[PDB]
Write a protein that binds this ligand. Structure first.
Ligand code: MN
Ligand code: MN
Ligand code: MN
Ligand code: MN
Ligand code: MN
Ligand code: MN
Lengths: 589, 589, 589
């Protein structure tokens, strides 16, 4: 399938049915069973793994079973030709190890050996993984716990989980390759993550780095380099759906009605320009701006904002809010992963979660750790339930996807769904639960409008953050948990003394009684940056798998050990201490 | 403050109050609060951190709050000329990360982010630490667990503990820089720790290595190159306060009455000469020995002794005993860290503990592990209380600071206090509890006097040892525990069959049920050398912090995990296995 | 001396007179001779080495001769508080190697051993250098070729040359530490050198990285955030001294008379703003812009320009031209090293040459290599003299210091002199030889004025370029040579078909018959980027010494081997192949 926004086609998953090369007996009796195994995996993935636009992932099966090097070479040729970015080998029998291996070092690979008794399927699995390990080609091994009868096309649950987790992580990794990260502006207020380390994007993600100074926005706004028809429709939509809340700026800091109107006009134009910069806009060609029409083929971008742009122009709050949302004046659509303060590392953190779930990701500051003692002292209230051990205030400096309201609903529960699953009611509720507030001029002299909402409680979420550490390189931290509801009177008190015009999410991480998850305080004290990315759901296991494919160690996470799924080679670096083994494996391989 | 013994001034602590650079509102409203925070830290440290001479540590505060690079540069400049060797950043608000960082890579640094809600102080803390981690500049993060109201000048208890631990460790590290380790003699009886590895002193401690052959003592003794007035006073003081115990040499091994007198004369001269070599003596200049009067600017030294010197001259027991003590014929004074058998690694082990406590350190041989079964077999006595699971006999080959008697008292409890806190009673009792015994001529053919005392039980102590391992470099081990008392009848039996003329300390390490602390035997079996250093108190946490600053991994320790305080970067190398992360951070950083 | 532009004081040079520690004879007979040597060096350096403002470098001499560690420590202490950034040891006798060494690893160091026979001065030189090499502390060795008699206070010519070269290189290195590189804008048109690699600035130069988006210029222009009194004076000065040349834009590409006036207004404001960002401006504080008044303490900066800014606003040609010049509306002054297209690597290339000469540096594109055959084919003219083997066209994209005209004169020869040596005639002629041309709107849509001049021939120059290569890091290339004159008829032809509105310098590199200097073509083909920095004079030897101090290998240079002056340790890595040894020493040390 053609990628609707980026150059080229969406990555495909290649299935390699390997078989015993011996004919006049063995192979003939296994041809149908082996190919059927491949077809079963394709059906499973097509019904459980989807591209960001909602289309089912597409699989490519080798033209023949692979019993030797000649057939392996033909599969490699076919896969390269059809744009395969992930590979899965399947077999119910013994096959000739290295003669049948996928030697492409540039694609995530897994092997599923049928747990059957008649043929050495598990023997091939272990044998070929030993080859992958010996050759330095990481590969995931999948082996079911319960013996299945020959030809059983029904894939067991434990196998299903591994196949899907691998496919999703592999697809996410394949999706980033060849795409750009667009830096709009430069470093923002000395934030480490706003410094672009090209080596990381190039070598770890296979991405390109594009740059554009914010002065570009001045030129396009002044010269009208954007779709004026869309602009008028957008401005109208904002007036009809974006509710303006109370101005918290006190006299001397309040902007005029005229200024506030212009703040909206420019904020909308900024959204259009940012999007045009990321994916281009064919409308610009008929307008005489052919170069601008191309776009930077960016699957993720960031906007510096402070301090240079915001000291004079409206801030990027609305732009950052709307782009990351799953809908706007043009209807429901896939989010545009856009980072506040040009924090590219948080941008990538958001991108990981997005490519694994197809859901909008929430940019946020890890603002405050509220202990039970502190809440009691300030509000007279005793935290209860999940919040009984303390809570963490997640609140970005003014921008957040409207999806963050938690108003989207499934089975009567708060969630964030892929845009293609949104109902008209989901969207209306997200908007109705949001208030746009005039920007605090003491911080943002140029004005603008911040996003004000309160995430509904009881929603499972995962916060994550990618950091780059000297002497180590990229490193990922994860914290699964839930959002929580505080009594209205309690929230109001904690909210007013912090930043009531910004978006609030009350988070409680799952505790393990070990590592950095002994208590809620430890989770925040161990976070490695001020920012984090929030995704709906518990995707820590998916993130761990994705990280291992990228060779990025996970310094901190609260995912149950039984759910850790990494390439077979990782076990060779240690089975008692998976953390240490992860570091050793990431460096050596 | 001028260093009373070494070249230059004592290290100062610089306080960096950072602030939001935005004026016309934000900054003006935070100037006082931020600067007051800096003043509060200076106050706390001056009341809790002291130089080795008892003088409170001195702090230097930046001339202005730091909201950008210009002010950061001014702070760096002031600190450099003020002689700052440790830096602490403080702030209750958001500041511009890299623009406000302390870029000096050669000084320990910490950052305290006020846990307030009005401004993003914890956000700056995390943001700038990400900067330090990304740039490879280790820095400690201090974040209080309970939200404080804007303007609160009080420093929470958890914050105080971290600030003080960091300050003490940082000061200890700064103290060693530029100082010398003086090697008197060469390797002693093939002891690995008596081999000097200059790379360690130079690269890890920033120290210089000085050398003097023991023949120097012969020259100074023969030519009277020492303060003769002090010598005569010292001799009288020794005869009056140092009581001679029974001679344990058998018939054909006792020295004549005339020899025993000369043994005392020489032992006292050795002490004078050793001290004169370490810190110089203006008296020598007046005598016509100007070069000798300068000294070697050594904050630590060692004396080979066996086998060459002791095969003919009185041993260094008295010299090693008195120099390490907190008093002598000239009254109470700071100890002179001096290593027996020129074991420079034990000397540094002692130096670490000394610089962190200002208390005399005990040099000791890890002589014997006595299991409950062994004690029972030999004495018929069943170990009780803390000693119930076994005890370890700590006893040096004849030398030990008199402070080791444990006669010094505080609140009715046995301790070792800084010399500036000693009472005449403390000193008097230390001397009364000690007997000086004629040296065993079969080992020390030249005679001498060993130190015989029994450390009082119930005193909290910490033993430690620094080792250098090929393929790793320096590595530190720590064991917190207590001294214990045994029935006199039991002590006599164990003592008599070991070395009754030497100093005894019965030690029991705290057990953890894991690692090398599953039982008392394991603590001994895992000790990496035959020597250790004993310090009063439980300073394992302090040693751990100091070790991390020096990038020296800790291979073994029994400090509660909640008390481990290392640079923020360490967590980036692992949160589940802190030991493995320690090795990774020390190596890569 | 206080640095007139940056925080703190200018770096000082410390002189360490070492001596034999033996008294009662040896030392007393050498006290005066040794201290006089130190005074002779201080005298020589003060008369030959100057700070960028023309002030003679200041030296600090140890308070006593250094015969042991105590005195060495005192010297280290005095130097640290005196602000010494370079050290030179001097002695006419034997001294105790490691006991007298300068152990500061963060400052360039040299040792001058008097070539006298009475005492082993050259023996100390070699002995202590062995110490520096063994300890990994690079140090330069200076040994005169002709024996001098005891007491000779004269410094031989060969010794003088080494002392001065070392002092100049050491001072340049010390100057950069603590200073900032200010990035105005981001990457320009995908130029690799415009990507900022903080690790290089931090670890190799000890510099800080500051960032400001170009939208800042929009704010300051619109809000009048600059000295308006100076602005008006500057405008008049420009109209009076900067003559406008013919407009080369064709019909539908010329800007209106009104636009051309505003182009000048903006170009002048840009220059003020850029300077204000680099070093601050107290005037801004009085105006109510206190944060802006501080500046970024930047000793070097760059302006992205294309494509974002120039696609709408007047280009930075005038700003880049005037800032790099040694004069402007405020009279003669030190240049402000400013990089076109935010090429920070060329900015540093310029900074190196500037700090070594105090002379304006020329930014240039290595535009064209003109072979004798090509010139002949296009003009019918046969290249003669130095240009006989081909010439290289050096011409930046519109900006170049007016010093580049070569109109400044000394002894009837064209040169570029420090601003403090300029005569009104020099300045006047530089301006007369320059024409400011309306910018080419097809490239610079916002207008602006380019600098058009022709560098006078016969001037010795050195071009250099710093590049960062993956798997190697920073690497420097140098090419000494001369500017040449071509018949006006010939120049016109080559100039017209290239870019006649830009500044031209015709360069001819010195050939060696080997390496990348076998012919003129090879010099160009081997250049590692499209840009280079031109400095007046042959400073390759000085750059080589500076590079070795910074541990930056020199991959290409045409400096005579007899003039290569690097730390003594370099020879330990090879004496036959100095290039290979350079790479080995830079990597291992
Ligand atoms: Mn933020
Ligand atoms: Mn709200
Ligand atoms: Mn011993
Ligand atoms: Mn006893
Ligand atoms: Mn150029
Ligand atoms: Mn011209």
């Amino acid at each position: 399938a053609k990628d609707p926004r980026y150059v080229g086609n969406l990555p495909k998953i290649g299935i390699r049915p390997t078989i015993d090369g011996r004919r006049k007996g063995v192979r003939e009796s296994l041809e149908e069973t082996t190919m059927n195994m491949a077809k079963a995996v394709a059906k499973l993935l097509e019904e459980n793994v989807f591209y960001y636009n909602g289309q089912p992932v597409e699989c490519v099966i080798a033209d023949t079973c692979i019993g030797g090097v000649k057939e392996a070479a033909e599969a490699a040729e076919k896969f390269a030709r059809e744009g395969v970015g992930v590979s899965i080998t399947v077999t119910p029998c013994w096959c000739y190890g290295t003669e049948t291996m996928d030697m492409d070092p540039h694609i995530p690979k897994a092997v599923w050996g049928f747990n059957g008794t008649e043929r050495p399927g598990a023997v091939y699995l272990a044998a070929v993984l030993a080859g992958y390990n010996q050759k330095g080609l990481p590969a995931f091994g999948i082996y079911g716990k319960d013996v299945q009868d020959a030809g059983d096309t029904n894939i067991p649950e434990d196998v299903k989980e591994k196949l899907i987790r691998f496919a999703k992580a592999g697809l996410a990794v394949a999706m980033m390759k060849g795409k750009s990260y667009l830096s709009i502006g430069s470093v923002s207020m000395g934030i480490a993550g706003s410094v672009v380390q090209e080596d990381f994007f190039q070598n770890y993600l296979g991405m390109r780095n594009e740059y554009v100074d914010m002065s570009e926005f001045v030129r396009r706004i002044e010269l009208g380099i954007y779709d004026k028809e869309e602009y008028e429709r957008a401005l109208k939509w904002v007036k009809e759906n974006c509710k303006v809340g109370p101005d918290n700026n006190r006299d001397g800091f309040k902007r005029t009605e005229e200024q506030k109107e212009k703040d909206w006009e420019i904020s909308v134009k900024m959204a259009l320009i940012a999007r045009d910069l990321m994916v281009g806009n064919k409308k610009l060609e008929e307008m005489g701006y052919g170069e601008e029409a191309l776009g930077r083929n960016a699957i993720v971008a960031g906007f510096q904002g402070q301090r240079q742009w915001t000291d004079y122009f409206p801030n990027g709050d609305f732009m950052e809010t709307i782009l990351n949302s799953s809908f706007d004046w043009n209807g429901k659509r896939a989010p545009y992963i856009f980072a506040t303060e040009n924090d590219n590392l948080n941008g990538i953190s958001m991108l990981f979660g997005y490519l694994l779930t197809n859901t909008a990701q929430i940019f946020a500051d890890v603002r405050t750790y509220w202990s039970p003692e502190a809440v009691k002292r300030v509000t007279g209230y005793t935290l209860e339930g999940r919040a009984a051990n303390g809570i963490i205030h997640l609140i970005n400096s003014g921008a957040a996807a409207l999806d963050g309201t938690g108003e989207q609903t499934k089975d009567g529960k708060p969630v964030i769904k892929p845009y293609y699953e949104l109902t008209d009611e989901d969207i209306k509720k997200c908007l109705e639960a949001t208030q746009f507030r005039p920007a605090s001029t003491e911080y943002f002299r140029g004005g603008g409008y911040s996003t004000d909402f309160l995430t509904k409680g009881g929603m499972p979420v995962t916060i994550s953050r990618l950091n780059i550490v000297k002497g180590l390189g990229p490193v990922l931290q994860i914290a699964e948990g839930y959002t929580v509801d505080l009594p209205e009177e309690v929230h109001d008190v904690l909210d007013k003394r912090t930043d009531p015009t910004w978006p609030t999410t009350w988070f409680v991480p799952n505790l393990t009684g070990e590592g950095a998850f002994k208590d809620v305080y430890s989770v925040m004290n161990n976070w490695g940056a001020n920012h984090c990315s929030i995704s709906y759901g518990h995707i820590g296991a998916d993130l761990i798998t994705l990280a291992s494919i990228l060779r990025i160690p996970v310094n901190m996470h609260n995912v149950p050990e039984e759910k850790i799924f990494r390439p077979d080679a990782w076990s060779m670096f240690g089975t008692k201490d998976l953390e240490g083994a992860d570091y050793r494996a990431c460096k050596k391989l």
